[PDB]
Design a protein around this ligand. Structure first.
Ligand SMILES: NC(=O)N[C@@H](CC(=O)O)C(=O)O
Ligand SMILES: O=C1C[C@@H](C(=O)O)NC(=O)N1
Ligand SMILES: [Zn+2]
Ligand SMILES: [Zn+2]
Ligand SMILES: [Zn+2]
Ligand SMILES: [Zn+2]
Lengths: 343, 343
């Protein structure tokens, strides 16, 4: 019965992959979102303007007729990246931002950044030109417990970085901790964050109690409930430097359900409705549009979308699976009911 | 190459399952261990003398010709269990011990315990007759974080229970925390513990960094490294009320590598050599025999085995999998080169 009309949203953190997987997954995004930040962790990674131009075209090829969707491309920072390559792509309208993957922190990150010190000239160029830095904020030393890697990053990397480059705009991507929530809340107008649906909806118990659930396995790892609760409070408060970033991160079923399952939730089909449920549960639907459709554009200095969509509070069962050319893709909340759906 | 000779060990915590699976797994235990505590969590559970007698015979049927193996049976404690049935089984030599799994208010009285207070009659009977209680010490309330469940059990159940029944003998099964190591270390002659090879060798980072590894998923869940180190220090100290219990807990590959992986490591094939590796790394091989072959017998009031086995420090590859009638079993350390093996 209940209908909620919002300005058309965007997705400020998305993985579209490539090849047949890209063809399968892009329509789940392009039918809803006006724009998406397209992450660059392909294999090999997108580290040049030419690679980004071609990838953008493969993405557009896969967008159904009638969807008005614009992919916003990013550069994968490496230790050896030429600042001129990065700036040229920014100047040509190819790169909207650049993504910092700590080496070996996450999916397709073996070529990532080994220290902020190795890439200072690149960061200094971004600061000069007003290019936002997107950060997967985790440390990677083998002896640091996985649940501590986000908090430890704040103290040891994020804060020194921001103190050195005071004009640099930073998005703390997919935050998962009270530590990061407080850090962002207490930050200045050059610091923002994205939050996924899964880090709002669940905590680590959901992944580990009654069985191990690899379709909830993603990075940064789901945390303790008190962290979940801090994230829900942050979005529900109306704080305007948090915004929608799904981190939809698809892997074939048997890559997820294996002896060493890949990290990432394929949440593009269900993310928007899932966010709506959270904001409703937090008695905060008045702030839902801004999170989805206003806060991101403002941080990035881009116009808000000029079209509108509707969500309805009518229960839909999520498909158990989505067909691929080989194997299947298991969506986030597969087989479950979602309370809101796109009209 | 170095030889390590010990009195024949026993396994004080084992899952043998039933039917075809039992036939496959028993030989991995019976070729090495003189005795094992056989856990009662079949479907339906072993809660009667008659069921235990028949299960013992099915186990004996599956022992290869020539192996000198004796299964020591257990009763699954439930709300509906008659204390006269338990006592009769104990008196007749059928039940060596009784096993208490976590309470759950919604469990069927035929299948479990709703609260420990509700089964005081049976626990008092065990105290009276000198029957040891084996405890899976976790509180499984939905609002308790999974990594907190063992520590919560110590405070909420274990200490009050032992204060209430001061003569009751208790094995704190498969301890996984510094909390439990300290508790057991500081206990009296009526409190002991078993420790699995996975909780000595690994911590939660091994299950979750670089991928999710369901073959390391087991209950109680792997904890942070500080806990692992406390366990290693405890066995290494020579403390004589900790002893070998593998918690070998086999599940078919398709039930481990699924959207909801079953808890349990099939470690019977590789456990003994893994414990040798840990004791060696801790420079504590002088305490290895007692852990495997003396401490358990002393606690249970049973004779030490009078035959010997030898481990050799020569590298060997662990099988990638072990065939079942249907599907396959993936052993603990599958495909790895291990340092110690049985001669
Ligand atoms: N988050 C994930 O668990 N996975 C992402 C990588 C990332 O966002 O770091 C992926 O690309 O698969
Ligand atoms: O408590 C338990 C039960 C066991 C099993 O599968 O029987 N597996 C575990 O991992 N621990
Ligand atoms: Zn990331
Ligand atoms: Zn991502
Ligand atoms: Zn157990
Ligand atoms: Zn067990």
């Amino acid at each position: 019965s209940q209908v909620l009309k919002i300005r058309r949203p965007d997705d400020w953190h998305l993985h579209l992959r490539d090849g047949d997987m890209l063809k399968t997954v892009v329509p789940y995004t392009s039918e809803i979102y006006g724009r998406a930040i397209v992450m660059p962790n392909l294999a090999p990674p997108v580290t040049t303007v030419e690679a980004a131009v071609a990838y953008r075209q493969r993405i557009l090829d896969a967008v159904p007729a009638g969807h008005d969707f614009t992919p916003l491309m990013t550069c994968y920072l490496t230790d050896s990246l030429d600042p001129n390559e990065l700036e040229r792509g920014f100047n040509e309208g190819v790169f909207t931002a650049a993504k910092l993957y700590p080496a070996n922190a996450t999916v397709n990150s073996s070529h990532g950044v080994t220290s902020v010190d190795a890439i200072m000239p690149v960061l200094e160029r971004m600061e000069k030109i007003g290019m936002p830095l997107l950060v997967h904020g985790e440390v990677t030393h083998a002896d640091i417990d996985i649940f501590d890697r986000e908090a430890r990053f704040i103290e040891s990397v994020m804060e020194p970085l921001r103190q050195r480059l005071t004009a640099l705009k930073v998005v703390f991507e997919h935050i998962t901790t009270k530590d990061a929530a407080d850090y962002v809340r207490d930050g200045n107008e050059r610091l923002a964050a994205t939050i996924t649906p899964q880090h709002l909806m669940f905590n680590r118990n959901h992944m580990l109690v009654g069985g191990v659930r690899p379709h909830l396995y993603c990075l940064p790892i789901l945390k303790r409930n008190i962290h979940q609760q801090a994230l829900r409070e942050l979005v529900a408060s109306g704080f305007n430097r948090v915004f929608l970033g799904t981190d939809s991160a698809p892997h074939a079923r048997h890559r997820k359900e294996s002896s060493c399952g890949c990290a990432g939730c394929f949440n593009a089909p269900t993310a928007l409705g899932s966010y709506a449920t959270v904001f409703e549960e937090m008695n905060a639907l008045q702030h839902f549009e801004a999170f989805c459709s206003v806060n991101g554009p403002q941080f990035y200095g881009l116009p808000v979308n000029d079209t509108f969509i509707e969500l309805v509070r009518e229960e839909q069962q999520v498909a158990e699976s989505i067909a691929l050319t080989d194997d299947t893709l298991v969506p986030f909340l597969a087989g479950e009911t979602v309370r809101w759906s796109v009209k």
